[PDB]
Design a binder for this molecule. Sequence first.
Ligand SMILES: [Ag+]
Ligand SMILES: [Ag+]
Length: 68
Amino acid sequence: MPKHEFSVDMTCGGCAEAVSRVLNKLGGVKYDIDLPNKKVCIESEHSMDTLLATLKKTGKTVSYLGLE
Ligand SMILES: [Ag+]
Ligand SMILES: [Ag+]
């Protein structure tokens, strides 16, 4: 199953919480948040568009670091 890696402008724990809330409301996702490195790793059959649009709902700078 595709593992997408994203960069999110998370400055503290409450940003990581904001990230989980939006990703939870999305559903169909297993996810991993690395706060010190400002990274979010997402196991999902969801398209990159959807994941990107979802993460951007937080109001924060989001970019795509790619896949594996
Ligand atoms: Ag924060
Ligand atoms: Ag915050």
